[PDB]
């Protein structure tokens, strides 16, 4: 009653326990996997295109600008490097340092246990002047590397183009809205990356690109809301290895919403990383605010939710070696995450402050009767 | 530059793909998975006891008095089974299948993974009236499978010993707060079953047993506020090939707190067991008020949040093939789930209500106050 799973059979014979499950949230889990390998290429600084394109067929192709993963052969195994890429469970090596990474996602490189979900997998590389191609099915190579043409222009890149496998995940399709809303997020999350999302079935086609990113991306969040000034405020920095990121705006209405995110995947329960923005953002408004005379007869202006009412922000960070509450997701444990944002958001929220007075005022205006609310409903509650 | 990683050698690779992290998280998944493999026998409904002693050099002992880790050749690899269960990434097969699991641990197994990240591992298996042993060390065989003697008193079962890979974790050590704490949550998960921490190192002991179950959790999660009865109600039952357990209290507060679990883990993010429990319990709630009279027409209209007011309730599900949304588990898909606790609770709780009128009736105007509190509050904020 008993077997060993070698390599890619694993894949197959447990796909929850690499997807988490086998109905439409996994199917797309793919489909986020591809398009992190692509995206991997633009934060390295190779691909500043991506296109993803459901074809009539139901498969999905998502193309990159990037390096075209090499096809030379590897010596231990007697293979090229991208046959050696989707076909073994896990590679790695040094090629993953040196770069920034999306986090998460599937086993190893996570190409592998998409090729063995998949009935079908189509990899073709631009490099050195051709065009390559090599196909799998399953996790095995059905069409050996080889080279089909040769390559345009410049253009060098890696084409995707797989189907998940029928046989696991039944009559599933792609959802163009799931598809579309990763891609708003990530153009968010690497502003100036360009990604196209074609759905040749409707001829629909969609650009999502956004110089602004999370900046943008905060005043997305508050779409249906007054807000208090229409420009977001943008903070950009790097302290040690991690790269920071934060985008807020305020609206007059009373409710809000903070999204956190760490190496481009949220990070639902926060972390380190967003309770350094609380606590750095407090800091700031607090200081500042006596130092211009705002506050009168020492009100009860923090409290933490008095500050959060109407504030929508993205805080997000990029940082090696990533550490999660457990299964590479949820909760960012990092400390040096936390002294980063905590000191990047620190110093600029003052000079912002300082330089838009009449807005800080507002927003630190709309903290006090924040508070009073809260006082309000309290009493009237504990009196009945 | 690539390396291919086969089995083990890439948990060493990366162990933070597998368990997390390097640090305090990381670590304890550990201990939580060889204790999960500890509780599958209970589950199984072979095990009545587990023992878990933290040895004064660091090292951890799990024994369960289960069917003890087969110690037959497995042809195929010609090894015992133990041997193949510790130094293989990914055995399976129908074993898989003979019972309710303990979900989300680690990769297969799991068992294989902490002995890859430990410098040292000691299994003992007590079967057929022998008592065996087998050493390990970072993922390999030191100590080949022997008999040291006879099983004393003929007991079968498996005891564990094991010690973090310092090079992985550093200094790091076993936190008895955290070793406890999930020892008293299992304890209520699997009602009966005796669990033990020993802490050798500050010369403590503590036994962890409850036949009360999922509704004693319920009582304990509402420690500190005075109860609006103080005996617990219990709702169980399966329907289909999914088992329920569904225990809660309510309080004379206005706080509360509602855990969710599937195969014994938590589910944060709730799933389809959470929303069927709120819409069974709301739905046996308002019908039960309509039936007995009590749905006064001088006031407001209790709604959600309303009648969760000072509720605590634990809502656990044991099921086959559990479907959560990839990532770090966090919220269940199985409509199945939905449809059994839906079905399970509803029913049932209509009983409770008729046979506790009293309660009954005391928990639905315990609802109506908290209706109109939560529109005293609005009136007081909308008049700022
Ligand atoms: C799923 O494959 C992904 C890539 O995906 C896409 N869409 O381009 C990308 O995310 C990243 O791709 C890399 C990652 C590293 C290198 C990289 O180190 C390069 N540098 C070299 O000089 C190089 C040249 C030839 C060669 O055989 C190797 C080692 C082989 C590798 C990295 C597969 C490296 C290079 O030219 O391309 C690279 C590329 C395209 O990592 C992979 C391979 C897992
Ligand atoms: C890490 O081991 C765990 C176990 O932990 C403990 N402490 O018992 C437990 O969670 C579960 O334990 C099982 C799981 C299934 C069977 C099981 O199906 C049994 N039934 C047999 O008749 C049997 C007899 C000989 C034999 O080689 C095998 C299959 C081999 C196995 C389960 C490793 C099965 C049996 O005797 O013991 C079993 C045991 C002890 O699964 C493991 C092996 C992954």
Do not use: C
């Amino acid at each position: 009653a008993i077997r060993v799973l070698k390599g890619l059979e694993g894949v197959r014979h447990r796909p929850a326990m690499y997807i988490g499950g086998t109905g439409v949230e996994g199917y797309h889990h793919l489909f986020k996997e591809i398009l992190d390998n692509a995206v991997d290429e633009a934060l390295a600084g190779y691909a500043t295109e991506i296109l993803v394109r459901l074809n009539e067929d139901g498969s999905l192709t998502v193309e990159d600008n990037g390096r075209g993963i090499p096809v030379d052969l590897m010596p231990e195994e007697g293979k090229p490097a991208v046959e050696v890429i989707y076909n073994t469970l896990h590679s790695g090596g040094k090629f993953e340092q040196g770069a920034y990474k999306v986090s998460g996602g599937l086993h190893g490189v996570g190409a592998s246990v998409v090729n063995a979900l998949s009935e079908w997998t189509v990899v073709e590389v631009f490099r050195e002047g051709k065009h390559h191609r090599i196909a799998f099915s399953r996790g095995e190579v059905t069409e050996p590397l080889r080279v089909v043409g040769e390559a345009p222009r410049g253009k060098t890149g890696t084409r995707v183009t797989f189907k998940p496998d029928p046989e696991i995940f039944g009559n599933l399709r792609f959802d163009p809205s799931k598809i579309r809303a990763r891609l708003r997020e990530v153009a968010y999350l690497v502003a100036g990356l360009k990604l196209v999302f074609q759905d040749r079935q409707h001829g629909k086609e969609e650009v999502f690109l956004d110089k602004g990113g999370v900046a943008s991306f905060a005043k997305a969040l508050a779409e249906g809301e007054d807000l208090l000034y229409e420009k977001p405020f943008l903070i950009r920095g790097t302290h040690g290895e991690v790269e920071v990121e934060v985008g807020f705006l305020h609206t007059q209405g009373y409710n809000a919403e903070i999204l956190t995110y760490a190496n481009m995947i949220p990070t639902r329960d926060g972390g380190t990383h967003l309770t350094a923005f609380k606590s750095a953002y407090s800091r700031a408004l607090n200081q500042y605010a006596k130092k211009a005379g705002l506050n009168k007869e020492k009100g009860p202006q923090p409290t933490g939710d008095d500050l959060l009412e109407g504030l929508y922000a993205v805080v997000s960070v990029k940082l090696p070696n990533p550490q999660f509450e457990g299964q590479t997701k949820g909760k960012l444990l990092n400390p040096e995450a936390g002294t980063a944002v905590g000191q990047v958001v620190y110093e600029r929220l003052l000079e912002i402050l300082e330089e838009n007075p009449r807005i800080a005022k507002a927003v630190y205006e709309k903290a006090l009767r924040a508070a009073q609310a809260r006082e309000a409903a309290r009493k009237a509650r504990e009196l009945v």
